[PDB]
Design a protein around this nucleic acid. Structure first.
Ligand SMILES: [Mg+2]
Ligand SMILES: [Mg+2]
Ligand SMILES: [Mg+2]
Ligand SMILES: [Mg+2]
Ligand SMILES: [Zn+2]
Lengths: 94, 136, 70, 125, 38
RNA sequence: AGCCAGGAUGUUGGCUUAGAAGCAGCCAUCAUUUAAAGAAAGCGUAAUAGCUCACUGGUCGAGUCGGCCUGCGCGGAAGA
Protein backbone atom coordinates (compact mmCIF):
# COMPACT_ATOMS: atom_id res chain seq x y z
CA UNK A 1 0.00 0.00 0.00
CA UNK A 2 1.72 3.10 -1.33
CA UNK A 3 0.83 6.60 -0.15
CA UNK A 4 1.41 9.75 -2.20
CA UNK A 5 0.94 13.34 -0.97
CA UNK A 6 0.03 16.01 -3.51
CA UNK A 7 -0.99 19.63 -3.96
CA UNK A 8 -3.22 20.93 -6.71
CA UNK A 9 -1.60 23.10 -9.36
CA UNK A 10 -2.23 26.84 -9.33
CA UNK A 11 -0.73 27.10 -12.80
CA UNK A 12 -0.41 24.96 -15.93
CA UNK A 13 1.37 24.73 -19.26
CA UNK A 14 4.97 24.54 -20.39
CA UNK A 15 6.53 27.19 -18.16
CA UNK A 16 4.78 26.02 -15.02
CA UNK A 17 5.95 22.49 -15.70
CA UNK A 18 9.59 23.17 -16.37
CA UNK A 19 9.80 25.37 -13.26
CA UNK A 20 8.09 22.56 -11.38
CA UNK A 21 10.64 19.99 -12.48
CA UNK A 22 13.57 22.31 -11.77
CA UNK A 23 12.16 22.67 -8.25
CA UNK A 24 12.27 18.87 -7.97
CA UNK A 25 8.56 18.26 -8.10
CA UNK A 26 6.70 17.01 -11.18
CA UNK A 27 3.20 17.30 -12.66
CA UNK A 28 0.59 14.57 -12.76
CA UNK A 29 -3.11 14.23 -13.39
CA UNK A 30 -5.99 12.19 -12.03
CA UNK A 31 -8.91 11.37 -14.30
CA UNK A 32 -11.56 8.73 -14.85
CA UNK A 33 -14.95 8.32 -13.23
CA UNK A 34 -17.73 10.87 -12.92
CA UNK A 35 -15.62 13.75 -11.61
CA UNK A 36 -13.53 16.41 -13.33
CA UNK A 37 -9.84 15.71 -14.06
CA UNK A 38 -7.69 16.88 -11.12
CA UNK A 39 -4.27 18.36 -11.93
CA UNK A 40 -1.64 17.78 -9.24
CA UNK A 41 2.07 17.93 -8.47
CA UNK A 42 4.22 15.32 -6.72
CA UNK A 43 7.56 15.21 -4.93
CA UNK A 44 9.90 13.59 -7.44
CA UNK A 45 12.10 11.47 -5.21
CA UNK A 46 9.29 9.84 -3.25
CA UNK A 47 7.49 8.68 -6.38
CA UNK A 48 10.77 7.80 -8.09
CA UNK A 49 11.61 5.42 -5.24
CA UNK A 50 8.09 3.99 -5.11
CA UNK A 51 7.81 3.20 -8.84
CA UNK A 52 10.97 1.10 -8.69
CA UNK A 53 8.81 -1.76 -7.33
CA UNK A 54 6.43 -3.72 -9.62
CA UNK A 55 3.52 -3.39 -7.19
CA UNK A 56 3.37 0.32 -7.93
CA UNK A 57 2.04 -0.28 -11.45
CA UNK A 58 -0.20 -3.25 -10.63
CA UNK A 59 -1.82 -1.94 -7.45
CA UNK A 60 -4.33 0.52 -6.03
CA UNK A 61 -2.59 3.52 -4.48
CA UNK A 62 -3.87 6.39 -2.36
CA UNK A 63 -3.24 10.02 -3.14
CA UNK A 64 -3.70 12.52 -0.34
CA UNK A 65 -4.91 15.87 -1.65
CA UNK A 66 -6.02 18.52 0.85
CA UNK A 67 -6.35 15.76 3.45
CA UNK A 68 -8.79 13.92 1.17
CA UNK A 69 -7.93 10.40 -0.05
CA UNK A 70 -8.37 9.18 -3.63
CA UNK A 71 -7.75 5.59 -4.71
CA UNK A 72 -6.08 5.30 -8.13
CA UNK A 73 -4.20 3.00 -10.49
CA UNK A 74 -1.12 4.07 -12.43
CA UNK A 75 -2.17 4.25 -16.07
CA UNK A 76 0.52 5.91 -18.15
CA UNK A 77 3.91 7.29 -17.16
CA UNK A 78 6.10 9.65 -19.15
CA UNK A 79 9.82 9.35 -18.43
CA UNK A 80 12.59 11.82 -19.22
CA UNK A 81 14.42 10.54 -22.30
CA UNK A 82 17.94 9.78 -21.03
CA UNK A 83 17.71 10.52 -17.29
CA UNK A 84 16.40 8.41 -14.36
CA UNK A 85 13.43 10.78 -13.79
CA UNK A 86 9.68 11.09 -14.39
CA UNK A 87 8.13 13.69 -16.67
CA UNK A 88 4.54 13.06 -15.69
CA UNK A 89 1.88 10.53 -14.58
CA UNK A 90 -1.70 9.55 -15.31
CA UNK A 91 -3.76 8.08 -12.51
CA UNK A 92 -7.16 6.68 -13.29
CA UNK A 93 -9.60 6.71 -10.38
CA UNK A 94 -10.04 3.13 -9.24
CA UNK B 1 28.37 -4.20 -42.76
CA UNK B 2 24.85 -2.83 -42.56
CA UNK B 3 23.49 -0.80 -45.48
CA UNK B 4 20.12 -0.40 -47.26
CA UNK B 5 19.65 -3.17 -49.85
CA UNK B 6 18.36 -0.60 -52.29
CA UNK B 7 17.07 2.94 -52.12
CA UNK B 8 14.81 5.33 -53.94
CA UNK B 9 17.72 7.79 -54.09
CA UNK B 10 21.50 7.64 -54.31
CA UNK B 11 22.54 10.88 -52.58
CA UNK B 12 21.07 12.90 -49.73
CA UNK B 13 20.89 16.29 -48.06
CA UNK B 14 23.15 16.87 -45.07
CA UNK B 15 20.23 17.84 -42.91
CA UNK B 16 20.25 18.62 -39.22
CA UNK B 17 20.10 16.37 -36.21
CA UNK B 18 17.78 17.84 -33.60
CA UNK B 19 15.28 16.93 -30.94
CA UNK B 20 14.94 13.78 -28.92
CA UNK B 21 14.70 10.13 -29.83
CA UNK B 22 11.75 7.85 -30.52
CA UNK B 23 11.89 4.40 -28.95
CA UNK B 24 13.65 5.43 -25.77
CA UNK B 25 12.52 2.16 -24.22
CA UNK B 26 13.54 -1.47 -24.24
CA UNK B 27 10.99 -3.31 -26.36
CA UNK B 28 12.66 -6.69 -26.78
CA UNK B 29 15.26 -7.86 -24.31
CA UNK B 30 15.83 -7.27 -20.62
CA UNK B 31 18.76 -4.85 -20.97
CA UNK B 32 19.74 -2.08 -23.34
CA UNK B 33 22.44 0.38 -24.26
CA UNK B 34 20.94 3.85 -24.61
CA UNK B 35 22.70 6.86 -26.14
CA UNK B 36 22.80 9.94 -23.94
CA UNK B 37 24.82 12.07 -26.36
CA UNK B 38 24.12 13.16 -29.93
CA UNK B 39 25.66 12.25 -33.29
CA UNK B 40 26.28 9.72 -36.05
CA UNK B 41 26.99 6.01 -35.93
CA UNK B 42 28.74 4.83 -39.06
CA UNK B 43 28.01 1.27 -40.16
CA UNK B 44 31.56 0.29 -39.20
CA UNK B 45 31.07 1.53 -35.66
CA UNK B 46 27.89 -0.45 -35.22
CA UNK B 47 29.70 -3.51 -36.53
CA UNK B 48 32.68 -3.13 -34.18
CA UNK B 49 30.46 -2.52 -31.15
CA UNK B 50 28.27 -5.51 -32.00
CA UNK B 51 31.40 -7.66 -32.37
CA UNK B 52 32.81 -6.58 -29.05
CA UNK B 53 29.63 -7.39 -27.13
CA UNK B 54 29.26 -10.64 -29.07
CA UNK B 55 32.75 -11.71 -28.00
CA UNK B 56 32.01 -10.73 -24.40
CA UNK B 57 28.86 -12.90 -24.15
CA UNK B 58 30.57 -15.77 -25.98
CA UNK B 59 27.60 -16.12 -28.33
CA UNK B 60 25.07 -16.82 -25.59
CA UNK B 61 21.77 -15.00 -25.06
CA UNK B 62 20.26 -12.79 -27.76
CA UNK B 63 21.22 -9.42 -29.22
CA UNK B 64 19.24 -6.79 -31.14
CA UNK B 65 20.43 -3.70 -32.98
CA UNK B 66 17.75 -1.03 -32.85
CA UNK B 67 19.64 1.41 -35.05
CA UNK B 68 20.27 1.22 -38.73
CA UNK B 69 22.59 3.21 -41.00
CA UNK B 70 20.14 4.36 -43.68
CA UNK B 71 21.60 7.76 -44.56
CA UNK B 72 24.39 7.98 -47.19
CA UNK B 73 27.38 10.30 -46.73
CA UNK B 74 29.50 11.63 -49.53
CA UNK B 75 33.09 12.71 -49.92
CA UNK B 76 34.94 14.65 -52.54
CA UNK B 77 38.24 12.83 -53.06
CA UNK B 78 41.70 14.35 -52.60
CA UNK B 79 42.98 17.13 -54.89
CA UNK B 80 39.56 18.17 -56.10
CA UNK B 81 38.19 21.70 -56.33
CA UNK B 82 34.85 22.78 -54.98
CA UNK B 83 31.83 22.26 -57.20
CA UNK B 84 31.56 20.14 -60.33
CA UNK B 85 28.72 18.27 -58.63
CA UNK B 86 28.11 16.40 -55.40
CA UNK B 87 30.73 13.92 -54.23
CA UNK B 88 30.33 10.14 -54.33
CA UNK B 89 28.86 7.99 -51.57
CA UNK B 90 31.56 6.68 -49.23
CA UNK B 91 29.65 5.17 -46.35
CA UNK B 92 26.40 5.12 -44.44
CA UNK B 93 25.31 6.47 -41.08
CA UNK B 94 22.56 6.37 -38.51
CA UNK B 95 21.53 9.63 -36.87
CA UNK B 96 21.33 9.36 -33.10
CA UNK B 97 19.47 11.62 -30.75
CA UNK B 98 19.67 11.59 -26.97
CA UNK B 99 17.52 8.80 -25.56
CA UNK B 100 17.85 6.29 -28.39
CA UNK B 101 18.32 2.63 -27.46
CA UNK B 102 21.11 1.29 -29.65
CA UNK B 103 21.48 -2.34 -28.59
CA UNK B 104 19.40 -4.71 -26.59
CA UNK B 105 20.28 -7.92 -24.92
CA UNK B 106 18.90 -10.76 -22.87
CA UNK B 107 19.29 -14.40 -21.90
CA UNK B 108 22.26 -13.36 -19.77
CA UNK B 109 22.79 -12.22 -16.14
CA UNK B 110 22.91 -8.48 -15.39
CA UNK B 111 26.63 -8.29 -14.62
CA UNK B 112 27.83 -9.89 -17.85
CA UNK B 113 25.58 -7.55 -19.85
CA UNK B 114 26.98 -4.50 -18.04
CA UNK B 115 30.52 -5.62 -18.82
CA UNK B 116 29.62 -6.33 -22.46
CA UNK B 117 27.89 -3.01 -23.05
CA UNK B 118 30.88 -1.27 -21.49
CA UNK B 119 33.19 -3.02 -23.96
CA UNK B 120 30.92 -2.05 -26.84
CA UNK B 121 30.49 1.53 -25.63
CA UNK B 122 34.26 1.84 -25.92
CA UNK B 123 33.94 1.56 -29.71
CA UNK B 124 31.24 4.21 -30.15
CA UNK B 125 31.76 7.97 -30.68
CA UNK B 126 28.82 9.08 -28.48
CA UNK B 127 28.26 9.06 -24.73
CA UNK B 128 26.18 6.10 -23.62
CA UNK B 129 24.50 4.55 -20.60
CA UNK B 130 23.10 1.23 -19.44
CA UNK B 131 19.35 0.84 -19.07
CA UNK B 132 16.86 -1.82 -18.07
CA UNK B 133 13.36 -2.92 -19.09
CA UNK B 134 10.53 -1.50 -16.98
CA UNK B 135 6.93 -2.56 -16.50
CA UNK B 136 4.81 0.10 -18.21
CA UNK C 1 44.72 -46.82 6.88
CA UNK C 2 41.66 -48.42 5.27
CA UNK C 3 41.69 -48.47 1.41
CA UNK C 4 40.35 -45.22 -0.18
CA UNK C 5 36.61 -44.57 -0.65
CA UNK C 6 37.33 -44.40 -4.40
CA UNK C 7 38.92 -47.92 -4.53
CA UNK C 8 36.08 -49.52 -2.53
CA UNK C 9 33.49 -47.81 -4.80
CA UNK C 10 35.46 -49.08 -7.83
CA UNK C 11 35.30 -52.69 -6.54
CA UNK C 12 31.66 -52.18 -5.40
CA UNK C 13 30.25 -51.06 -8.78
CA UNK C 14 32.23 -53.86 -10.46
CA UNK C 15 34.36 -51.35 -12.38
CA UNK C 16 38.07 -50.55 -12.78
CA UNK C 17 38.17 -46.76 -13.32
CA UNK C 18 35.56 -44.16 -12.32
CA UNK C 19 34.01 -41.71 -14.81
CA UNK C 20 36.04 -39.21 -16.87
CA UNK C 21 33.08 -36.82 -16.83
CA UNK C 22 31.37 -37.47 -13.41
CA UNK C 23 27.57 -36.88 -13.15
CA UNK C 24 27.50 -36.70 -16.99
CA UNK C 25 28.78 -40.20 -17.76
CA UNK C 26 27.38 -42.76 -15.25
CA UNK C 27 29.89 -45.64 -14.96
CA UNK C 28 28.05 -48.08 -12.64
CA UNK C 29 25.68 -48.66 -9.71
CA UNK C 30 25.98 -49.51 -5.99
CA UNK C 31 23.13 -50.46 -3.58
CA UNK C 32 22.77 -48.81 -0.13
CA UNK C 33 24.07 -52.04 1.47
CA UNK C 34 27.41 -51.54 -0.36
CA UNK C 35 27.36 -47.85 0.71
CA UNK C 36 26.93 -48.98 4.35
CA UNK C 37 29.65 -51.69 4.30
CA UNK C 38 32.10 -49.38 2.51
CA UNK C 39 31.17 -46.61 5.00
CA UNK C 40 31.68 -49.10 7.86
CA UNK C 41 35.30 -49.70 6.72
CA UNK C 42 35.44 -45.95 6.17
CA UNK C 43 33.63 -45.67 9.57
CA UNK C 44 36.79 -47.23 10.98
CA UNK C 45 38.45 -44.35 9.01
CA UNK C 46 35.78 -41.50 9.25
CA UNK C 47 34.91 -38.47 11.44
CA UNK C 48 31.18 -39.36 11.52
CA UNK C 49 29.00 -39.74 14.62
CA UNK C 50 26.41 -41.80 12.70
CA UNK C 51 26.07 -44.44 9.95
CA UNK C 52 24.09 -41.95 7.81
CA UNK C 53 26.91 -39.37 8.02
CA UNK C 54 29.68 -41.69 6.77
CA UNK C 55 27.36 -43.30 4.19
CA UNK C 56 26.66 -39.70 3.00
CA UNK C 57 30.41 -38.90 2.66
CA UNK C 58 30.71 -42.15 0.66
CA UNK C 59 27.60 -40.99 -1.30
CA UNK C 60 29.54 -37.83 -2.12
CA UNK C 61 32.66 -39.82 -3.10
CA UNK C 62 30.23 -41.94 -5.22
CA UNK C 63 28.81 -38.90 -7.07
CA UNK C 64 32.22 -37.20 -7.59
CA UNK C 65 33.56 -40.12 -9.65
CA UNK C 66 30.24 -40.66 -11.49
CA UNK C 67 28.86 -43.84 -9.83
CA UNK C 68 25.08 -43.99 -9.14
CA UNK C 69 23.31 -45.44 -6.09
CA UNK C 70 20.93 -48.26 -7.13
CA UNK D 1 26.70 -13.61 8.78
CA UNK D 2 23.82 -14.34 11.16
CA UNK D 3 20.32 -12.86 11.19
CA UNK D 4 19.31 -11.39 14.60
CA UNK D 5 16.65 -14.15 14.86
CA UNK D 6 19.31 -16.87 14.37
CA UNK D 7 21.21 -15.41 17.34
CA UNK D 8 17.95 -15.12 19.38
CA UNK D 9 17.26 -18.84 18.70
CA UNK D 10 20.84 -19.74 19.65
CA UNK D 11 20.65 -17.66 22.91
CA UNK D 12 17.37 -19.45 23.70
CA UNK D 13 19.08 -22.84 23.09
CA UNK D 14 22.20 -22.18 25.21
CA UNK D 15 19.86 -20.76 27.92
CA UNK D 16 17.58 -23.85 27.69
CA UNK D 17 20.56 -26.22 28.12
CA UNK D 18 21.91 -23.89 30.87
CA UNK D 19 18.65 -24.37 32.82
CA UNK D 20 18.93 -28.21 32.75
CA UNK D 21 22.66 -28.72 33.42
CA UNK D 22 24.26 -29.31 36.86
CA UNK D 23 27.91 -28.35 36.19
CA UNK D 24 29.38 -26.12 33.46
CA UNK D 25 33.10 -26.01 32.56
CA UNK D 26 34.30 -23.05 30.44
CA UNK D 27 37.58 -23.81 28.59
CA UNK D 28 39.64 -22.19 25.79
CA UNK D 29 39.29 -24.18 22.54
CA UNK D 30 42.30 -22.63 20.71
CA UNK D 31 45.12 -24.37 18.83
CA UNK D 32 43.29 -27.68 18.38
CA UNK D 33 42.63 -29.70 15.18
CA UNK D 34 39.01 -30.72 14.53
CA UNK D 35 39.93 -34.44 14.87
CA UNK D 36 40.86 -33.89 18.55
CA UNK D 37 37.54 -32.04 18.72
CA UNK D 38 35.69 -34.94 17.02
CA UNK D 39 37.29 -37.15 19.73
CA UNK D 40 36.23 -34.73 22.53
CA UNK D 41 32.69 -34.61 21.03
CA UNK D 42 32.66 -38.45 21.00
CA UNK D 43 34.00 -38.61 24.60
CA UNK D 44 31.52 -35.79 25.30
CA UNK D 45 28.53 -37.67 23.84
CA UNK D 46 29.78 -40.62 25.93
CA UNK D 47 29.58 -38.86 29.34
CA UNK D 48 26.26 -37.06 28.69
CA UNK D 49 28.21 -33.82 28.19
CA UNK D 50 26.98 -30.93 25.99
CA UNK D 51 29.82 -29.13 24.15
CA UNK D 52 29.60 -25.84 22.21
CA UNK D 53 31.70 -22.95 20.87
CA UNK D 54 29.61 -19.76 20.77
CA UNK D 55 30.01 -15.95 20.57
CA UNK D 56 30.87 -14.56 24.03
CA UNK D 57 28.37 -11.68 23.79
CA UNK D 58 25.74 -14.40 23.17
CA UNK D 59 27.16 -16.44 26.07
CA UNK D 60 26.57 -13.53 28.51
CA UNK D 61 22.90 -13.42 27.30
CA UNK D 62 22.48 -17.18 27.92
CA UNK D 63 24.43 -16.81 31.22
CA UNK D 64 22.44 -13.78 32.48
CA UNK D 65 19.52 -16.18 33.02
CA UNK D 66 20.80 -17.51 36.38
CA UNK D 67 22.83 -18.78 38.18
CA UNK D 68 25.72 -18.44 35.70
CA UNK D 69 26.36 -14.68 36.12
CA UNK D 70 29.77 -15.48 37.67
CA UNK D 71 31.09 -16.88 34.34
CA UNK D 72 30.90 -13.48 32.54
CA UNK D 73 34.60 -12.96 33.42
CA UNK D 74 35.67 -16.35 31.99
CA UNK D 75 34.28 -15.24 28.61
CA UNK D 76 37.40 -13.15 27.90
CA UNK D 77 39.28 -15.26 25.34
CA UNK D 78 37.75 -17.89 22.97
CA UNK D 79 35.16 -19.93 24.92
CA UNK D 80 34.21 -23.64 24.65
CA UNK D 81 31.45 -24.60 27.12
CA UNK D 82 30.77 -28.07 28.58
CA UNK D 83 27.32 -28.58 30.19
CA UNK D 84 26.84 -31.88 32.04
CA UNK D 85 23.05 -32.35 31.99
CA UNK D 86 22.97 -35.93 33.32
CA UNK D 87 25.34 -36.49 36.29
CA UNK D 88 27.51 -33.62 37.60
CA UNK D 89 31.28 -33.38 36.93
CA UNK D 90 33.01 -35.74 34.43
CA UNK D 91 33.56 -32.79 32.06
CA UNK D 92 35.95 -31.43 34.72
CA UNK D 93 37.93 -34.72 34.69
CA UNK D 94 37.99 -34.99 30.85
CA UNK D 95 38.91 -31.32 30.14
CA UNK D 96 42.00 -31.57 32.40
CA UNK D 97 43.23 -34.87 30.90
CA UNK D 98 42.52 -33.33 27.47
CA UNK D 99 44.41 -30.10 28.36
CA UNK D 100 47.27 -32.21 29.78
CA UNK D 101 47.45 -34.83 26.97
CA UNK D 102 47.11 -32.28 24.15
CA UNK D 103 49.06 -29.59 26.06
CA UNK D 104 46.86 -27.13 24.15
CA UNK D 105 44.61 -24.20 25.16
CA UNK D 106 43.72 -23.22 28.75
CA UNK D 107 40.62 -24.51 30.61
CA UNK D 108 40.12 -21.15 32.40
CA UNK D 109 37.19 -21.23 34.91
CA UNK D 110 34.25 -23.48 35.88
CA UNK D 111 30.85 -23.06 37.60
CA UNK D 112 28.98 -25.14 40.24
CA UNK D 113 26.62 -24.49 43.23
CA UNK D 114 25.92 -21.04 41.76
CA UNK D 115 29.62 -20.22 42.12
CA UNK D 116 32.79 -19.74 40.05
CA UNK D 117 35.61 -22.30 40.47
CA UNK D 118 39.12 -20.95 39.47
CA UNK D 119 41.49 -22.79 37.05
CA UNK D 120 43.53 -24.56 39.78
CA UNK D 121 40.66 -25.62 42.09
CA UNK D 122 38.44 -27.39 39.50
CA UNK D 123 40.39 -30.44 40.77
CA UNK D 124 37.55 -30.44 43.35
CA UNK D 125 35.09 -31.30 40.56
CA UNK E 1 57.13 2.48 -15.08
CA UNK E 2 54.35 2.75 -17.68
CA UNK E 3 53.37 6.36 -18.25
CA UNK E 4 49.84 6.62 -19.63
CA UNK E 5 46.57 8.52 -19.43
CA UNK E 6 44.57 5.63 -17.96
CA UNK E 7 45.75 4.03 -14.71
CA UNK E 8 44.02 1.07 -13.04
CA UNK E 9 44.24 -1.69 -10.43
CA UNK E 10 45.64 -4.86 -12.03
CA UNK E 11 45.18 -6.83 -8.79
CA UNK E 12 44.35 -6.67 -5.07
CA UNK E 13 48.01 -5.94 -4.26
CA UNK E 14 48.00 -2.75 -6.33
CA UNK E 15 47.34 0.51 -4.46
CA UNK E 16 46.42 3.82 -6.07
CA UNK E 17 47.92 6.87 -4.38
CA UNK E 18 48.25 10.53 -5.39
CA UNK E 19 51.69 12.08 -4.98
CA UNK E 20 52.29 15.74 -5.80
CA UNK E 21 49.45 16.34 -8.27
CA UNK E 22 50.07 12.96 -9.94
CA UNK E 23 48.07 9.71 -9.73
CA UNK E 24 50.33 6.68 -9.17
CA UNK E 25 49.98 2.93 -8.80
CA UNK E 26 52.25 1.08 -6.40
CA UNK E 27 52.38 -2.68 -6.04
CA UNK E 28 54.09 -4.41 -3.11
CA UNK E 29 54.36 -7.56 -5.22
CA UNK E 30 55.16 -6.76 -8.84
CA UNK E 31 57.33 -3.68 -9.72
CA UNK E 32 56.34 -4.55 -13.32
CA UNK E 33 52.88 -3.32 -12.26
CA UNK E 34 54.09 0.23 -11.43
CA UNK E 35 52.18 2.95 -13.32
CA UNK E 36 51.97 6.71 -13.56
CA UNK E 37 49.25 8.89 -15.00
CA UNK E 38 50.49 11.45 -17.52
C1' A F 1 40.80 -1.69 10.30
C1' G F 2 44.72 -4.17 12.96
C1' C F 3 46.48 -8.11 15.95
C1' C F 4 46.02 -13.64 18.31
C1' A F 5 44.29 -18.59 16.66
C1' G F 6 42.01 -22.26 13.90
C1' G F 7 41.65 -22.95 8.22
C1' A F 8 39.72 -30.07 9.68
C1' U F 9 37.86 -35.76 7.53
C1' G F 10 36.56 -38.87 3.38
C1' U F 11 40.77 -37.55 0.06
C1' U F 12 46.00 -38.02 -3.16
C1' G F 13 37.36 -36.75 -5.24
C1' G F 14 37.22 -39.19 -10.43
C1' C F 15 39.53 -38.80 -15.49
C1' U F 16 44.63 -37.81 -17.43
C1' U F 17 49.88 -38.00 -16.69
C1' A F 18 56.41 -40.37 -15.49
C1' G F 19 54.00 -37.20 -11.59
C1' A F 20 48.61 -33.67 -11.05
C1' A F 21 48.26 -34.90 -3.81
C1' G F 22 42.98 -27.51 -3.84
C1' C F 23 46.69 -25.21 -7.01
C1' A F 24 48.71 -28.22 -16.30
C1' G F 25 44.01 -29.87 -18.07
C1' C F 26 38.90 -32.31 -18.29
C1' C F 27 34.39 -33.57 -15.13
C1' A F 28 31.93 -33.46 -10.65
C1' U F 29 32.08 -29.78 -6.57
C1' C F 30 29.29 -33.81 -2.89
C1' A F 31 29.30 -35.12 2.35
C1' U F 32 31.44 -35.23 7.24
C1' U F 33 33.22 -33.03 12.10
C1' U F 34 32.10 -27.97 12.98
C1' A F 35 32.66 -21.59 15.93
C1' A F 36 34.24 -21.86 11.01
C1' A F 37 37.31 -24.16 6.90
C1' G F 38 36.24 -23.56 -1.41
C1' A F 39 36.91 -31.05 -3.71
C1' A F 40 40.06 -24.37 -2.81
C1' A F 41 41.33 -17.30 -4.15
C1' G F 42 47.08 -16.57 -5.04
C1' C F 43 52.25 -18.04 -4.38
C1' G F 44 55.06 -22.56 -4.21
C1' U F 45 57.02 -28.34 -5.53
C1' A F 46 59.51 -33.13 -10.40
C1' A F 47 54.58 -34.61 -7.50
C1' U F 48 54.30 -33.52 -2.27
C1' A F 49 55.79 -30.48 1.40
C1' G F 50 55.45 -25.08 2.61
C1' C F 51 53.42 -19.53 2.52
C1' U F 52 48.66 -17.32 2.48
C1' C F 53 43.20 -16.39 1.33
C1' A F 54 37.74 -17.38 1.47
C1' C F 55 35.35 -18.56 6.62
C1' U F 56 35.11 -18.44 11.99
C1' G F 57 36.28 -17.89 17.61
C1' G F 58 39.06 -13.89 20.52
C1' U F 59 40.77 -8.97 21.46
C1' C F 60 39.39 -3.94 20.31
C1' G F 61 34.96 -0.40 21.21
C1' A F 62 31.54 3.13 17.29
C1' G F 63 30.42 4.35 13.35
C1' U F 64 31.28 1.90 8.65
C1' C F 65 30.23 -0.08 3.35
C1' G F 66 28.74 1.23 -2.17
C1' G F 67 25.51 3.05 -5.44
C1' C F 68 22.06 7.25 -7.14
C1' C F 69 21.68 12.33 -8.71
C1' U F 70 24.41 16.51 -9.11
C1' G F 71 28.36 21.44 -8.09
C1' C F 72 33.49 22.73 -8.45
C1' G F 73 38.19 20.69 -9.31
C1' C F 74 42.97 16.97 -10.89
C1' G F 75 45.46 14.17 -14.94
C1' G F 76 44.86 13.57 -20.26
C1' A F 77 47.75 18.97 -22.08
C1' A F 78 54.47 19.03 -26.70
C1' G F 79 57.18 23.99 -31.14
C1' A F 80 59.99 26.90 -33.09
MG1 LIG G 1 9.59 29.12 -23.54
MG1 LIG H 1 14.98 21.48 -41.68
MG1 LIG I 1 59.33 15.09 -6.62
MG1 LIG J 1 37.46 -7.10 13.17
ZN1 LIG K 1 50.37 -6.46 -8.62
Amino acid sequence: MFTINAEVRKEQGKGASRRLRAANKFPAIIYGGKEAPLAIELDHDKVMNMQAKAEFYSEVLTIVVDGKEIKVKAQDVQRHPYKPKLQHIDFVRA
Amino acid sequence: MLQPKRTKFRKMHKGRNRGLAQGTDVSFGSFGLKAVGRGRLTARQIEAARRAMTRAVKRQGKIWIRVFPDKPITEKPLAVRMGKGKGNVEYWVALIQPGKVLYEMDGVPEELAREAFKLAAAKLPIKTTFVTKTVM
Amino acid sequence: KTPPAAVLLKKAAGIKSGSGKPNKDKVGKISRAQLQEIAQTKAADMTGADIEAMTRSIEGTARSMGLVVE
Amino acid sequence: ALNLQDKQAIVAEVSEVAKGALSAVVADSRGVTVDKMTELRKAGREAGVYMRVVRNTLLRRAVEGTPFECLKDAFVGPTLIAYVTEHPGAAARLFKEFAKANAKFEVKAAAFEGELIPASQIDRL
Amino acid sequence: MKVRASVKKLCRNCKIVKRDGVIRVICSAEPKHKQRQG
